[PDB]
Design a protein around this nucleic acid. Structure first.
Lengths: 296, 293
DNA sequence: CGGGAATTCCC
DNA sequence: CGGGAATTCC
């Protein structure tokens, strides 16, 4: 079985592998169907910017002695059995849910993906769509388990990386697969990105009980709670799913401060926290008042 | 004589057409004067009758010229795909249709449908074996109507029929049509109702923000209005700026300056959303006013 | 293609 | 007898 022993043949030098330098933006990318007819996406890098928005960039380490290497981006689930995900990855140089780039190892080992996007297949396909790929020998881990336990996260996926090397000799070895920081579709209310868009007043007495309105992006009533968290304190309002006007507005009641009135007012930030995974949103400016203000 | 009259009229807007993948029992087309406490249905009647008789009723094309329709009315007592027929007792000469729903045919299918529905009005009745000739016409009258049949607004055509001796119904009557009914879903057809609003108490002049919550409305064909005209009218808007139309289901605007010269005691007026073209409306929401300070 | 909205389905 | 997710279309 075992070919050779731990002979100091390699010696802390060889042993090539790769690494994601810039992860693909978590959630924000709208998966598209083969119905919307598309081919190039816009996927960004985890930490981009509305300005010079970064992009999914990766490099190679220990590629020395290598002439030319090929990358293999493909979509797999998010848990243990990273089976080949049904949603195919489209874009330039993407044949079947897989992209390839014969990047020259030495002379600049780094590829920044540009026009890159996903393609979400309808549900009544999902399974078969996995069979197709299977047949065409597509499974970066060969673990296809269909018909029994399914439940596939049609909203998130991991893009596996299989980088194949090539030397002069007939010793074309293969490195180890690399997984990405899960990608979440923007079109899904459950996993989209949270965001308030406006609020009633900016100042409210610490007496609380004050009712305030608010607009937002499609959120799931039966799973969401507005908070007034801050340094030293974290008090979240109260209301019921009944006040979640058609997934784009909330009618809550400002909870009282942490028992305080001490002189002039203190500002606090308010944002949304999904009662399921935690993902918060861009906080908004709010202010509490020290009880009444009886005076002239 | 051959006189017919729709007593209760079908609710014009509020009934949600249902798709086939949805089911045949989500309810029955209600009536105008039908509300909680006491329901009401699309009832018709016959004056100067001639005794027992039936009443075929199908869905016609909203286009004034009474013509067929792709949306086949469906229900317990319905000819599968088409007309629902009932009867009447010798005295009670009025028919009421409780359970009555409408089958919504997809845009991608309202084609093969209407055409097929035409084949029956032809090939089905009269001599069988329709000739390739008619086939061509069928395909014409079909598509030659697709763009003139609002797939989201229908009218009932209550067609009564008596028995022409020999014990057999066949004597037509005066088929009258029910005023259109807007699919409670079609983007431009539902009822411009209003869930609730932010600050209830306005101000005085004309410039105060209030967060208003409503039902699906398009980026236009929309505009808030308030009033109370025991006189010859009086109106006022708020903000025709779309930017403030939050995802179809909400609008925030500034209160318009009422010509309330009489800055006396507080005056409370009416307020209700309206549609431009359609000219819809909502209910009586109380918007009070106050004396500036 | 992006960004939005109408349309068909599924709870 | 409505709400909103899933798909398509502009």
């Amino acid at each position: 079985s075992c070919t050779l022993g731990r002979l100091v043949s390699p010696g802390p030098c060889p042993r090539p592998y790769l690494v994601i330098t810039e992860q693909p933006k978590q959630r924000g990318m709208r998966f598209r169907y083969e119905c919307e007819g598309r081919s190039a996406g816009s996927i960004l890098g985890e930490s981009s910017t509305e300005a010079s928005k970064t992009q999914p960039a990766i490099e190679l380490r220990d590629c020395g002695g290598l002439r030319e290497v090929e990358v293999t981006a493909c979509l797999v689930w998010k848990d243990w059995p990273h089976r080949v995900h049904p949603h195919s990855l489209v874009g330039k140089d993407c044949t079947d849910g897989v992209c390839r780039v014969r990047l020259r190892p030495h002379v600049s080992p780094r590829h920044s993906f540009n026009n890159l996007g996903i393609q979400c297949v309808r549900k009544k396909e999902i399974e078969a769509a996995i069979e197709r790929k299977i047949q065409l020998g597509i499974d970066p881990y060969n673990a296809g388990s269909l018909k029994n336990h399914q439940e596939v996260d049609m909203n998130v996926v991991r893009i596996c990386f299989q980088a194949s090397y090539r030397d002069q000799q007939g010793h074309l070895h293969r490195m180890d697969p690399i997984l990405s920081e899960p990608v979440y579709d923007k079109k899904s209310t459950n996993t989209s990105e949270l965001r308030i868009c406006r609020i009633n007043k900016e100042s409210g007495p610490c007496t609380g009980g004050e009712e305030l309105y608010l607009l937002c992006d499609k959120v799931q009533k039966e799973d969401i709670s507005v908070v007034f968290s801050t340094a030293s304190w974290e008090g979240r309002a109260d209301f019921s799913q009944a006040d979640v006007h058609r997934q784009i507005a909330i009618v809550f009641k400002t909870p009282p401060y942490e028992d305080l009135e001490i002189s002039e007012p203190v500002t606090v930030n308010v944002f949304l926290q999904r009662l399921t995974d935690g993902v918060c949103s861009e906080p908004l400016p709010f202010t509490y008042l020290p009880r009444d203000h009886d005076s002239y | 004589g051959p006189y017919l009259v729709i007593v209760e009229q079908p609710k014009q807007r509020g009934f949600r057409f249902r798709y086939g993948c949805e089911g045949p029992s989500h309810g029955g087309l209600p009536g105008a004067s039908s509300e909680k406490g006491r329901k009401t249905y699309p009832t018709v009647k016959i004056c100067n009758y001639e005794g027992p008789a039936k009443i075929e009723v199908d869905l016609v094309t909203h286009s004034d010229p009474p013509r067929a329709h792709a949306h086949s009315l469906v229900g317990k007592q319905c000819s599968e795909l088409g007309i629902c027929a009932v009867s009447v007792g010798p005295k009670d000469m009025t028919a009421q249709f409780n359970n009555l729903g409408v089958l919504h045919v997809t845009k991608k299918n309202m084609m093969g449908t209407m055409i097929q529905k035409l084949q029956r009005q032809r090939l089905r009745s009269r001599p069988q074996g329709l000739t390739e000739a008619e086939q061509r016409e069928l395909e014409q009258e079909a598509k030659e109507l697709k763009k003139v049949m609002d797939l989201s607004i229908v009218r009932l055509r209550f067609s009564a029929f008596l028995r022409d001796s020999d014990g057999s119904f066949s004597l037509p009557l005066k088929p009258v049509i029910s005023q259109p009914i807007h699919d409670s879903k079609s983007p431009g057809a539902s009822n411009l109702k209003i869930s609730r609003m932010d600050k209830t108490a306005g101000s005085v002049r004309g410039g105060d923000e209030v967060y208003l919550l409503c039902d699906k409305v398009q980026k236009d064909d929309i505009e808030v209005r308030f009033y109370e005209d025991d006189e010859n009218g009086w109106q006022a808007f708020g903000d025709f700026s779309p930017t403030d139309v939050h995802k179809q289901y909400a609008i925030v605007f500034r209160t318009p300056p009422y010509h309330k010269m009489k800055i006396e005691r507080p005056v409370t007026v009416f307020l209700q959303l309206k549609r431009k073209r359609g000219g819809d409306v909502s209910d009586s929401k109380q918007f009070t006013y106050y004396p500036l300070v």
